Amino acid sequence: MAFEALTGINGDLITRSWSASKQAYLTERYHKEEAGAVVIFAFQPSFSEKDFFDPDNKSSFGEIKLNRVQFPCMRKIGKGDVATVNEAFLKNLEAIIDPRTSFQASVEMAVRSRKQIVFTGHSSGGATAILATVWYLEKYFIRNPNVYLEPRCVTFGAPLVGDSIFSHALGREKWSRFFVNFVSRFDIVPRIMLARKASVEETLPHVLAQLDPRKSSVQESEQRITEFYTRVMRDTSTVANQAVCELTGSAEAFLETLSSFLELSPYRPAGTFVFSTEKRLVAVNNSDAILQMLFYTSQASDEQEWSLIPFRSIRDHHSYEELVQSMGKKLFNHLDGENSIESTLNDLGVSTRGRQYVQAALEEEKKRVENQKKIIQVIEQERFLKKLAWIEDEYKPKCQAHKNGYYDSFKVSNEENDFKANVKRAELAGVFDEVLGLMKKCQLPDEFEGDIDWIKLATRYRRLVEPLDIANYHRHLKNEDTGPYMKRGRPTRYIYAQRGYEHYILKPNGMIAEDVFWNKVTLKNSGSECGSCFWAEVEELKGKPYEEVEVRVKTLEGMLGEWITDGEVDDKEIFLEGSTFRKWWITLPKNHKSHSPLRDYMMD
């Protein structure tokens, strides 16, 4: 029952998915099956060299970057890097979603009928199903999350699709629980994509033809299978060793030196992988642990084990029927939940070094959780909130009552309030820089960026401290040594907080912040994107003739209303009599002085 408790899929659903996948062999493109209130889509597997490695691809691995418009959530929120997926699988998916196939209409009709959607497939086609699930997660679930709209992805021996960025994006959105992948102990198909194309290009067509269940009459060449297995195992061993060395943070200088001389596959497991053996069922939820188990399970033990492993690996690709039929006669164990994993790994054939590596990978997650707990405890301290309360409720009201904006006061003054504000700003900047470094070094859970409280705290800190940082930057005349503040002076933490806030507020809609900005709109590294950076723009625009730059002024005037409405800037302090912005606007010639749209906000 624990399998149903964890994965959320019953044995009957697994049997129906396997039956649909088997039936999809005869059918073309996709096959739709309606069982009760469940709609299952099975994608037809394809067995050809071009279906795994794209002929047009020039890289050593058939990987291409995703499109931001198509998959806005499949990227890193902070770094901004997009994920990479297989080119052939992406092309097959794009052909599937073509309007001529009527797949979109069927999906819409099934969604409107309030029926659960299950995506299933076998071999490479099954991998395509995973992409389809992501498509669903980018079309309906993200628009309005609901229990009835929760999808289900089931794959049987599907090869790896996404890289580490793909897995991180799946984990951050809490979508990894909807993917279940059944992989045999000796299955070789999931390990195919972990090898370079040049090593196995000669032997790929023969192995792919042999693996085809439709036409198994082809003559078996043991030498070719042995060479293919040897190359795949060597590449998998190299990839796993490098990954486990990098994860533990050891030999970093040696790894950095050797990275340039090595070309390794970037594909990483994504989803809940469950390993099937003769009488046990083990499910793993950690990508590094899944990769280590995938490498270590397919190993020999003695001479009798050899000379038969490649044949068993070839045969096991069509042995999922026995596992599906005999699902209820095998024990189910969770590797992460269990405390003692020695017996399970010994039963599955993992060696001692594999056990140690799996244990280290599991302990890495616990260390990350402990770091997140420590960060939360530090954040929830009384003094951290006291500093922000003092900044918001004492310095700003006093400056406003002093007829001078607090930005201008921080720019030039000689009072103890400025010194205290600078000290508090330095302390807050140090704390946030420590948090940003911890996040950058991949030592925090993927869900940390998804926390609403953290996003709100970061947004408040930015909106309260960024003008002070700009004033400090422009007070010491640092803009004449490096350049504009937004070019090479803006701290990374503010950019990360702004990107997180924009993603949080734009995820229900679907557009990237750039689209919204450009749609609303020389503007290279401009200040019209961030409300808190408006002061910096005033620094750049002032001291220049009106004729040279005019469009930036108009853009600033247009965005000022939105910034005021959203609370990015306060009209009481930035429109003060002694503010530098008022003086700059006074110096502006009479034409724009009379054509400005905020007259009611300035003229008394």
Binding site: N414, E416, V423
Partner: protein
């Protein structure tokens, strides 16, 4: 003018004399409380307790306008930010009532302000054995010897306000029946040189010395041993080679010395001579850089009670012989940035009662301080609160106060 006169009519004659004294004392400057108490002690013979009681009684009115006064922490603490300022109208008042007698002026000899001239009322009467219980002379570029003869057969207190760089000393002390207080104040921006210091050795009855910002003359055996001097306070002075030399025994020259203060003085890398005095009772060093370690000869002193070490950076470590002091009641270390660890046997000080280590980057408190039964008050930072409460668990009477760091810009003004 009338209101404070009426108040003076209501004051006791002793407190009236004290009010006149402080009021006629030089204005527009910060006057330490210790000097004022010493002046009252040697003038009215009221002793320190009654002097402090009088100060507290007079603190109610505006004639003794108080300052921050952080001395409320304990009574064993010294003087720091405790200066008292008075109004110039009160100064003129105290100068008014019977204080311009031509020849006699039985008390309160004053000078309204620094000038290269002397008061014509007393200048004309050169031959005047005037009773001079209180003398305060303010002189700028003019010579200290003056142009007449102050015999002063009954003088008790002498205060001088000085200036310029090259200067001499008057021969008045040579023709002096008795004297107890001698204060020299220099307001220049550069060290001031003094000439003719042998005349000051004529009288040994002096009990307090308040030199400041000057070239401390080197001690010599020809100097008469001051058997009554008790206080030597040097602030912003120039030790140069006066205290560096060790040929002459300072204990023989100053056997009654009990309190020595060195503040804001550089070029003081040698302290063996200071520790060589066996009569030392309260030693305080404040803001003295260029000091590596204290000399390992403090075991000679067996009566030292206070070891205030305010500021004094670049101090590598505390001496191991400090624990041998039998009556070290008070230890004060503040603003130290080079101290990393206390002595291992620091807890053997059975006479220790209060210790201050504010803004001190201490690494680890030794377990020996767990035996500090007599320790009562600890003023430290929040970092050491845990290992001070660990001591407080053993001794319930221990009280720990966390000193908050206040950010002020008042230091920039000075």
């Amino acid at each position: 003018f009338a209101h404070m006169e009426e108040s003076l009519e209501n004051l006791d004659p002793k407190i009236r004399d004290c009010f006149l004294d402080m009021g006629a004392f030089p204005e527009d400057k910060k006057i330490p409380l210790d000097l004022l108490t010493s002046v009252w002690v040697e003038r009215h013979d009221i002793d320190e307790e009654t002097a402090f009681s009088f100060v507290l009684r007079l603190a109610d009115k505006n004639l003794l306008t108080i300052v921050n006064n952080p001395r409320f922490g304990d009574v064993h603490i010294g003087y720091y930010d405790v200066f008292v300022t008075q109004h110039d109208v009160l100064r003129d008042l105290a100068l008014h009532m019977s204080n311009r007698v031509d020849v006699n002026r039985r008390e309160r000899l004053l000078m309204p302000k620094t000038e290269p001239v002397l008061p014509r009322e007393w200048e004309k009467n050169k031959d005047e054995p005037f009773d001079a219980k209180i003398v305060s002379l303010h002189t700028g570029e003019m010579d200290e010897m003056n142009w007449f003869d102050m015999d002063l057969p009954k003088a008790e207190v002498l205060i001088l306000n000085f200036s310029s760089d090259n200067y001499v000393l008057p021969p008045f002390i040579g023709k002096m029946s008795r004297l107890r207080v001698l204060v020299i104040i220099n307001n220049g921006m550069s060290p001031a040189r003094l000439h003719g210091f042998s005349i000051f050795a004529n009288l040994a009855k002096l009990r307090s010395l308040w030199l400041k910002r000057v070239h401390v003359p080197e001690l010599t055996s020809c100097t008469i041993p001051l058997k009554n001097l008790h206080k030597i306070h040097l602030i912003f002075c120039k030790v140069k080679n006066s205290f560096v030399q060790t040929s002459f025994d300072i204990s023989k020259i100053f056997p009654s010395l009990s309190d020595l203060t060195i503040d804001h003085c550089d070029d003081l890398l040698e302290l063996k001579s200071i520790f060589g005095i066996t009569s030392l009772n309260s030693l305080s060093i404040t803001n003295c850089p260029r000091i590596l370690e204290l000399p390992k000869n403090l075991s000679n002193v067996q009566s030292l009670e206070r070891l205030r070490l305010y500021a004094c950076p670049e101090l590598i470590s505390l001496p191991v012989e400090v624990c041998e002091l039998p009556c070290l009641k008070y230890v004060d270390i503040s603003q130290c940035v080079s101290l990393v660890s206390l002595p291992e046997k620091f807890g053997k000080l059975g006479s220790l009662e209060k210790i201050d280590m504010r803004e001190c980057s201490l690494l680890g408190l030794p377990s020996s301080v767990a035996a500090l039964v007599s320790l009562r008050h600890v003023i430290c930072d929040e970092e050491t609160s845990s290992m001070w409460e660990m001591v407080k668990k053993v001794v319930p009477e221990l009280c720990i106060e966390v000193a908050k760091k206040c950010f002020t810009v008042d230091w920039l003004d000075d």
